[PDB]
Subunit: 237 residues, 4 copies
Amino acid sequence: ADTIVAVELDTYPNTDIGDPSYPHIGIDIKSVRSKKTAKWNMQNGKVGTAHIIYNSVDKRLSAVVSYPNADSATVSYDVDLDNVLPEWVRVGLSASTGLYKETNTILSWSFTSKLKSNSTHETNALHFMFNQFSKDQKDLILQGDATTGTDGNLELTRVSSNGSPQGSSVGRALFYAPVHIWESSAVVASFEATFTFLIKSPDSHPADGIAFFISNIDSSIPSGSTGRLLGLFPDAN
Amino acid sequence: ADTIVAVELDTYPNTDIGDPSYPHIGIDIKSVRSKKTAKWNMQNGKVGTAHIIYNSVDKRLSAVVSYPNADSATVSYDVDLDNVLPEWVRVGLSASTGLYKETNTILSWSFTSKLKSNSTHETNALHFMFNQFSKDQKDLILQGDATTGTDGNLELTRVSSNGSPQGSSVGRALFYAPVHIWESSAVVASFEATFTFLIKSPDSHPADGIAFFISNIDSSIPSGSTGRLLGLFPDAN
Amino acid sequence: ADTIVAVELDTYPNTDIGDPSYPHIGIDIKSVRSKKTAKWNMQNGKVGTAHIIYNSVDKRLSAVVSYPNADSATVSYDVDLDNVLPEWVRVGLSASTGLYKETNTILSWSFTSKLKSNSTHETNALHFMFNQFSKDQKDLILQGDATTGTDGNLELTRVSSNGSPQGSSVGRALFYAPVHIWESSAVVASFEATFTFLIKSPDSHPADGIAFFISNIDSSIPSGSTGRLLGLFPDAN
Amino acid sequence: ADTIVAVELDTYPNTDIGDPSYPHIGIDIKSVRSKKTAKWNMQNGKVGTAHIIYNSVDKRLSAVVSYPNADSATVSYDVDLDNVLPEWVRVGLSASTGLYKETNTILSWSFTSKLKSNSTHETNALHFMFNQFSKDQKDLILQGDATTGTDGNLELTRVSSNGSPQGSSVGRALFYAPVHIWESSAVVASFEATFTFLIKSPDSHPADGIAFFISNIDSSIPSGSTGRLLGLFPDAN
Ligand SMILES: CO[C@H]1O[C@H](CO[C@H]2O[C@H](CO)[C@@H](O)[C@H](O)[C@@H]2O)[C@@H](O)[C@H](O)[C@@H]1O
Ligand SMILES: CO[C@H]1O[C@H](CO[C@H]2O[C@H](CO)[C@@H](O)[C@H](O)[C@@H]2O)[C@@H](O)[C@H](O)[C@@H]1O
Ligand SMILES: CO[C@H]1O[C@H](CO[C@H]2O[C@H](CO)[C@@H](O)[C@H](O)[C@@H]2O)[C@@H](O)[C@H](O)[C@@H]1O
Ligand SMILES: CO[C@H]1O[C@H](CO[C@H]2O[C@H](CO)[C@@H](O)[C@H](O)[C@@H]2O)[C@@H](O)[C@H](O)[C@@H]1O
Ligand SMILES: [Ca+2]
Ligand SMILES: [Ca+2]
Ligand SMILES: [Ca+2]
Ligand SMILES: [Ca+2]
Ligand SMILES: [Cl-]
Ligand SMILES: [Mn+2]
Ligand SMILES: [Mn+2]
Ligand SMILES: [Mn+2]
Ligand SMILES: [Mn+2]
């Protein structure tokens, strides 16, 4: 199936499957059962920022999530992406809701990837920045319920006409061009992703969360991955 | 058919269709018959650099082609791209040979596009830089005889095993992701493209040329566009 | 004395000295009497954006000023900066008030300059971006009444504790490092500057304006340059 | 005195003071006796590249030094720069020779710094790239024997008219503008430095080395810091 490396911003604790008993951010390597998690003081209705970084020298995937004037949550995990992902991948954002729901609104998203060749010592680079999403954003592959243009935002999961989030929704947005994430002959390689989001929920328990992911080029939403599986995994193994 | 805006580095003068009687660089707007040209002292076997710029404030497309320690050739043309191209396009490089030939080798290629919206005054941007091309360059759509990986270069037209260029060849390389080149609510929109090339020819008259182009997203090589047509136009009109 | 090239956002019409009879943007080359102006529909109390561009190929200094969802004002003037400015300069923002006043608040400021060698075809570049100004911004040279840190903004002219603008004020802010704006052996040189401002006035006629400027490295506020002189010129000649 | 954090490319082993018995790269925190070192297969007369990265999330300073088609040497050290350096600093390059010598030629140098505020979540950034050094490089503070312009290169240490390196030389080059390396209210802060060098020596043992360093703004070369002190420290403690 698909190979997924993801940083999840999990708003709903699903303890039956390994989740700690509070909202949290985690690093998922081919499984929804986070290799490492951190407590996340999610604020309903506020705009927050997630920053994801990695480099081939340190081989550490790190993420910082925060809201203005509040403490940030950080999670890091040592992982050599060379052994996990194919050299060419697609990057994207995914979100879901189940019995409980929330808006999974993306207000901005940027990504920078750099590869320095050992033979050449010159760099190949890719950078994209979205601060506005149009109703016909052709450089984005929208999967599931994901839509763009509403107020210039990216809505990963279904929201009704009047602005209310729907349950049992799943959606993803992948950047159109494949990304060369690693290469055997590379001296240094690194990527950095940033996105601002707005998670808002009418009910007591918001669910299920947002995730920045890296996958094989032809990745598709596994059937039935609504809710706990965050639109990324086919099962809870 | 296709909508094409291109900057050509024409090495072969086809006077029957409007070419000046010497190698030159030109700005082509929907026709191979350049709106503006400038004399170009092409140097057989030397590595050159081409720099193309445009901004929606001035509405002027400019290109500078030069070799290290030599005079540069410059050509500019006032054109409002909103009236010629669709708002979403693909960018690429094209080349061809005919009775006469030449290698149409690309050693590097970079492009940067920016769009500042009117509703938000926030910018969307795209940037890619290739200084090395691998044998499996998944973020390039290769058309015709174009290939990559040979010495880390991009060969737009057919070259034999021993390095000799072939005639009646046409090839193009387009960046995988569509580019939002303009929008009605844009305060400013600009792009910049740079590429280094190596044109080498065994015969007295090198042909036919290399071109940086912008087209509709689904653009493909028009049949019989070898030689003078540079793999861009269906006829000489 | 000083050599000044500037783009003014002139809010007060001083018809005695050439100003047209309405708010306007203009290009000033060594004199407060602009070489070219354009009507500017200034909006009291709204945040606007100014974008200034120039390149050595077209040798045209262009500027666009606009407010979200409003028409933009544009002004362009052909000028070869090599003949006017020394090769090493400082870039900054200046503002003033006189009998009438306004806040001359700068919310963000970025600048990018690139010089490309003819010998090498390689680039030297400088880029800075301020989206926040701290109380002790060591990379900015503040002159006159300019201060930083208040709400993380840069106040070019005097503003009272309660937020009310004072008359007869003048202040500037220059980036600390000299900038290599042009070079004889350069193939292509270009610069781009962007700043967001907030001009708010309690009285009927706001005055006097804000200006982006380029000057010799050791430039200082000319004595008596409040009001119509915008902290840039010693007289109205 | 001064506060120095440096990455040294030490070519001469001074075993009395801690150096391992071979050329190496190391991370120095307020002392010439490196906290961590790694064997470095220095190649006399070849052009190499040094890449230094740091981010405040991982709080790890890493450096990779290599030559095209050769293995790289890597060294990392966990250090929270907030506890050692002031929030504003100057960045530079230093080099020295003693009884033995070498050319300490810098061919290129780039640096990028970014600081994201907690209060706002907006980034302040600084970027400079030098691929050519001119005879009057006004944005560099040259100290000691350092000079620029020769072939467009930066010579940190004294080289005679005929290209031969001198002994007992020391020199540094610092970027003119102070750099905001950290802040209490920062969500993320990171920097990346890259430079290409050419170490060539006529004698059997090249000495003494090159260092990328970060210091207090008003740092100057300590007197007598030739040889093993690399133009950075007053003594060997
Ligand atoms: C009723 O208890 C069980 O089911 C609960 C509901 O589970 C759905 O909703 C979740 C939150 O949106 C989602 O994560 C899950 O996949 C289901 O779609 C659940 O809260 C309990 O933990 C339990 O499994
Ligand atoms: C026989 O003369 C005519 O054809 C000549 C050859 O034309 C081919 O080769 C050209 C150069 O490679 C190319 O531009 C053209 O499209 C054909 O592929 C031509 O050189 C003469 O000018 C004339 O048209
Ligand atoms: C008395 O009329 C003359 O002076 C008036 C006041 O001029 C001051 O205020 C102006 C607006 O702040 C400023 O531009 C000028 O330099 C003086 O500080 C002026 O309004 C009239 O136009 C006239 O010059
Ligand atoms: C007498 O042997 C000792 O000193 C030698 C000379 O030391 C000078 O030169 C060194 C190499 O350039 C330099 O590192 C040092 O600071 C002095 O300037 C040295 O070569 C021997 O290894 C030994 O320490
Ligand atoms: Ca969960
Ligand atoms: Ca032709
Ligand atoms: Ca005026
Ligand atoms: Ca040593
Ligand atoms: Cl000593
Ligand atoms: Mn989880
Ligand atoms: Mn032509
Ligand atoms: Mn005026
Ligand atoms: Mn050492």
